[PDB]
Design an enzyme around this catalytic site. Sequence first.
Site, PDB file in Angstrom:
ATOM      1  N   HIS A  74       0.773  -1.099  -0.005  1.00  0.00           N
ATOM      2  CA  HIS A  74      -0.086   0.035  -0.043  1.00  0.00           C
ATOM      3  C   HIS A  74       0.748   1.355   0.081  1.00  0.00           C
ATOM      4  O   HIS A  74       1.961   1.066   0.196  1.00  0.00           O
ATOM      5  CB  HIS A  74      -1.028  -0.122   0.849  1.00  0.00           C
ATOM      6  CG  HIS A  74      -0.482   0.237   2.487  1.00  0.00           C
ATOM      7  ND1 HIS A  74       0.711  -0.427   2.981  1.00  0.00           N
ATOM      8  CD2 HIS A  74      -0.656   1.092   3.483  1.00  0.00           C
ATOM      9  CE1 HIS A  74       0.975  -0.027   4.110  1.00  0.00           C
ATOM     10  NE2 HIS A  74       0.133   0.795   4.521  1.00  0.00           N
ATOM     11  N   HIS A  76       1.435   3.853   2.097  1.00  0.00           N
ATOM     12  CA  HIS A  76       2.097   4.425   3.318  1.00  0.00           C
ATOM     13  C   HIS A  76       3.312   4.204   3.186  1.00  0.00           C
ATOM     14  O   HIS A  76       4.011   3.289   2.781  1.00  0.00           O
ATOM     15  CB  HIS A  76       1.270   4.034   4.494  1.00  0.00           C
ATOM     16  CG  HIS A  76       0.053   4.506   4.927  1.00  0.00           C
ATOM     17  ND1 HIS A  76      -0.661   3.810   5.600  1.00  0.00           N
ATOM     18  CD2 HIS A  76      -0.479   5.693   4.417  1.00  0.00           C
ATOM     19  CE1 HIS A  76      -1.949   4.635   5.614  1.00  0.00           C
ATOM     20  NE2 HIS A  76      -1.777   5.780   5.080  1.00  0.00           N
ATOM     21  N   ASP A  78       5.745   2.919   5.308  1.00  0.00           N
ATOM     22  CA  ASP A  78       6.104   1.734   5.916  1.00  0.00           C
ATOM     23  C   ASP A  78       6.229   0.548   4.904  1.00  0.00           C
ATOM     24  O   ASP A  78       6.919  -0.408   5.008  1.00  0.00           O
ATOM     25  CB  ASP A  78       5.589   1.325   7.292  1.00  0.00           C
ATOM     26  CG  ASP A  78       3.973   0.835   7.259  1.00  0.00           C
ATOM     27  OD1 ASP A  78       3.533   1.038   5.986  1.00  0.00           O
ATOM     28  OD2 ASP A  78       3.654   0.414   8.415  1.00  0.00           O
ATOM     29  N   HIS A 136      -7.420  -1.325   6.159  1.00  0.00           N
ATOM     30  CA  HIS A 136      -6.435  -0.130   6.439  1.00  0.00           C
ATOM     31  C   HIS A 136      -6.210   0.920   5.822  1.00  0.00           C
ATOM     32  O   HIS A 136      -6.004   2.186   6.208  1.00  0.00           O
ATOM     33  CB  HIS A 136      -4.980  -0.934   6.526  1.00  0.00           C
ATOM     34  CG  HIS A 136      -4.001  -0.039   7.224  1.00  0.00           C
ATOM     35  ND1 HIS A 136      -3.706   0.570   8.156  1.00  0.00           N
ATOM     36  CD2 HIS A 136      -2.749   0.246   6.152  1.00  0.00           C
ATOM     37  CE1 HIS A 136      -2.719   1.495   8.011  1.00  0.00           C
ATOM     38  NE2 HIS A 136      -1.916   1.294   7.054  1.00  0.00           N
ATOM     39  N   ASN A 164      -3.082   3.170  12.652  1.00  0.00           N
ATOM     40  CA  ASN A 164      -3.155   4.079  12.053  1.00  0.00           C
ATOM     41  C   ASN A 164      -4.841   4.054  11.210  1.00  0.00           C
ATOM     42  O   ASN A 164      -4.650   3.297  10.513  1.00  0.00           O
ATOM     43  CB  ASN A 164      -2.380   4.647  11.096  1.00  0.00           C
ATOM     44  CG  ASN A 164      -2.543   5.958  10.460  1.00  0.00           C
ATOM     45  OD1 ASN A 164      -3.476   6.795  10.805  1.00  0.00           O
ATOM     46  ND2 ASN A 164      -1.911   6.072   9.383  1.00  0.00           N
TER      47      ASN A 164
HETATM   48  C1  LIG Z   1       4.067   3.713   9.874  1.00  0.00           C
HETATM   49  C2  LIG Z   1       3.270   4.330   8.849  1.00  0.00           C
HETATM   50  O1  LIG Z   1       3.753   4.017   7.509  1.00  0.00           O
HETATM   51  C3  LIG Z   1       1.780   4.055   8.905  1.00  0.00           C
HETATM   52  C4  LIG Z   1       1.567   2.802   7.805  1.00  0.00           C
HETATM   53  O2  LIG Z   1       1.711   3.300   6.696  1.00  0.00           O
HETATM   54  O3  LIG Z   1       1.384   1.677   8.266  1.00  0.00           O
HETATM   55  C5  LIG Z   1       1.206   3.479  10.367  1.00  0.00           C
HETATM   56  N1  LIG Z   1       0.203   2.343   9.883  1.00  0.00           N
HETATM   57  C6  LIG Z   1       0.096   1.533  10.908  1.00  0.00           C
HETATM   58  C7  LIG Z   1      -0.717   0.349  10.830  1.00  0.00           C
HETATM   59  O4  LIG Z   1      -0.067  -0.536  10.427  1.00  0.00           O
HETATM   60  O5  LIG Z   1      -1.979   0.417  10.741  1.00  0.00           O
HETATM   61  C8  LIG Z   1       0.854   2.157  12.000  1.00  0.00           C
HETATM   62  S1  LIG Z   1       0.697   1.740  13.891  1.00  0.00           S
HETATM   63  C9  LIG Z   1       1.183   0.099  14.379  1.00  0.00           C
HETATM   64  C10 LIG Z   1       0.030  -0.832  14.482  1.00  0.00           C
HETATM   65  N2  LIG Z   1       0.391  -1.608  15.627  1.00  0.00           N
HETATM   66  C11 LIG Z   1       1.867  -1.275  15.999  1.00  0.00           C
HETATM   67  C12 LIG Z   1       2.351  -1.691  17.349  1.00  0.00           C
HETATM   68  N3  LIG Z   1       3.504  -2.189  17.459  1.00  0.00           N
HETATM   69  S2  LIG Z   1       4.791  -1.389  16.990  1.00  0.00           S
HETATM   70  N4  LIG Z   1       6.205  -1.569  18.286  1.00  0.00           N
HETATM   71  O6  LIG Z   1       4.383  -0.051  17.210  1.00  0.00           O
HETATM   72  O7  LIG Z   1       5.471  -1.628  15.884  1.00  0.00           O
HETATM   73  C13 LIG Z   1       2.077  -0.042  15.590  1.00  0.00           C
HETATM   74  C14 LIG Z   1       1.931   3.200  11.553  1.00  0.00           C
HETATM   75  C15 LIG Z   1       1.829   4.201  12.601  1.00  0.00           C
HETATM   76 ZN   LIG Z   2      -0.656   2.044   6.361  1.00  0.00          ZN
HETATM   77 ZN   LIG Z   3       1.758  -0.120   8.971  1.00  0.00          ZN
END
Ligand SMILES: C[C@@H](O)[C@@H](C(=O)O)[C@H]1NC(C(=O)O)=C(S[C@@H]2CN[C@H](CNS(N)(=O)=O)C2)[C@@H]1C
Ligand SMILES: [Zn+2]
Ligand SMILES: [Zn+2]
Length: 216
Positions: A74, A76, A78, A136, A164
Amino acid sequence: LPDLKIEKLEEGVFVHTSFEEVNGWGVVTKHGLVVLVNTDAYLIDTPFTATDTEKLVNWFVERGYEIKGTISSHFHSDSTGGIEWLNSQSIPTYASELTNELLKKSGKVQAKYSFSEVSYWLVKNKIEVFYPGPGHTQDNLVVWLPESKILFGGCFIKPHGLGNLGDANLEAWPKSAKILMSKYGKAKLVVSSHSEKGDASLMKRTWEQALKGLKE
Ligand SMILES: C[C@@H](O)[C@@H](C(=O)O)[C@H]1NC(C(=O)O)=C(S[C@@H]2CN[C@H](CNS(N)(=O)=O)C2)[C@@H]1C
Ligand SMILES: [Zn+2]
Ligand SMILES: [Zn+2]
């Protein structure tokens, strides 16, 4: 803090893990895969940064592999953070047409190649890319490895909190989770972006978390 980690799951399948501090989620742990087909390597999602993507590519290049392609699950950061650096190295980057337009609209660099197919083979009989529907994000994809029966669910698989919700489709996510469960019940392993790897039940946990999150 730490450098990208690489861990073997089984013959020809590696997990790459990268870490990035992202305003007000603290340090995010992100899993992708590297899949080997003969002496060719495919990146399933890029790490967060050019730096980690270079470390990842160099690790497989030094061990004799050609990087034939990357797929971003996707739009985003990451999943796509490495695209600009891979493009500069002429390593083919792939994303859905929708993902590439979401990147454009976000003022980010696009993958060089795009595709619109719901089910298509990135590599025939080895790497399948599947759109279960929005969750997501509107564009979220999963990657199926038929030989190993491993499913990469990316940020769509969320057994323990949805994370998110900024770009999430909570109305669609339960329907999309059911579609995924129906297609990939035969997964012996589900690798997600941010959760521990587990069995097929992570798809059912995601369905439950999606419903819970929808119910405000
Ligand atoms: C990173 C950014 O690129 C975004 C993305 O695009 O995914 C955000 N998206 C998501 C997600 O996956 O929904 C997240 S929150 C993720 C859900 N739970 C994890 C708890 N564990 S830890 N130790 O924080 O890794 C944190 C990101 C902030
Ligand atoms: Zn995302
Ligand atoms: Zn993510």
